[PDB]
Amino acid sequence: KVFGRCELAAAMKRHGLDNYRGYSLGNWVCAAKFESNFNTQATNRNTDGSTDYGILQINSRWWCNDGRTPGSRNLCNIPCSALLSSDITASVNCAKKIVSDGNGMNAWVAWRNRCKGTDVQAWIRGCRL
Ligand SMILES: Cn1c(=O)c2[nH]cnc2n(C)c1=O
């Protein structure tokens, strides 16, 4: 599923991401924009053999099981395929664990490089939320 900007903001708020760990909804929408272009089915293979899955490009080396990332963990206790669903529940629940791991949203390198410090409120501007 390719979400619209405000559609994804509303789904993220519905699932308790707005201001989760202090990160406003615009931060989450901005991260999703540059990680996946709002596409739940986005996947991207990393140099190390791990793979990033879903709207927030959650990585198989720590967070989900894809059966093909040697030495990895599955800390969200989910198959990585669950991160590709049109329903974003699994991605949101896992992202809550990631953002709580110590480094906040810096775990998403695209958030650090393209959202952090910017006018992230623009990402939810005009949305009925
Ligand atoms: C060492 N290490 C990490 O580097 C890491 N990165 C993300 N989760 C992590 N966990 C749980 C971890 O133990």
Swiss-Prot record:
The active site is at residues 35, 52. Residues 1-129 form the C-type lysozyme domain. GO terms for biological process: cell wall macromolecule catabolic process; defense response to bacterium; defense response to Gram-negative bacterium; defense response to Gram-positive bacterium; killing of cells of another organism. It catalyses: Hydrolysis of (1->4)-beta-linkages between N-acetylmuramic acid and N-acetyl-D-glucosamine residues in a peptidoglycan and between N-acetyl-D-glucosamine residues in chitodextrins. Its main location: secreted. It is found in: Secreted. Substrate binds at residue 101. In the egg white and polymorphonuclear leukocytes. Disulfide bonds join 6-127, 30-115, 64-80, 76-94. The keyword Secreted applies. GO terms for molecular function: beta-N-acetylglucosaminidase activity; identical protein binding; lysozyme activity. Its EC number is 3.2.1.17. SMART domains: LYZ1. SUPFAM superfamilies: Lysozyme-like. Transmembrane segments: none annotated. InterPro entries: Glyco_hydro_22 (IPR001916), Glyco_hydro_22_CS (IPR019799), Glyco_hydro_22_lys (IPR000974), Lysozyme-like_dom_sf (IPR023346). GO terms for cellular component: cytoplasm; endoplasmic reticulum; extracellular space. Keywords: Allergen, Antimicrobial, Bacteriolytic enzyme, Disulfide bond, Glycosidase, Hydrolase, Secreted, Signal. Lysozyme C is capable of both hydrolysis and transglycosylation; it also shows a slight esterase activity. It acts rapidly on both peptide-substituted and unsubstituted peptidoglycan, and slowly on chitin oligosaccharides. Lysozymes have primarily a bacteriolytic function; those in tissues and body fluids are associated with the monocyte-macrophage system and enhance the activity of immunoagents. Has bacteriolytic activity against M.luteus. Belongs to the glycosyl hydrolase 22 family. Monomer. This is Lysozyme C.
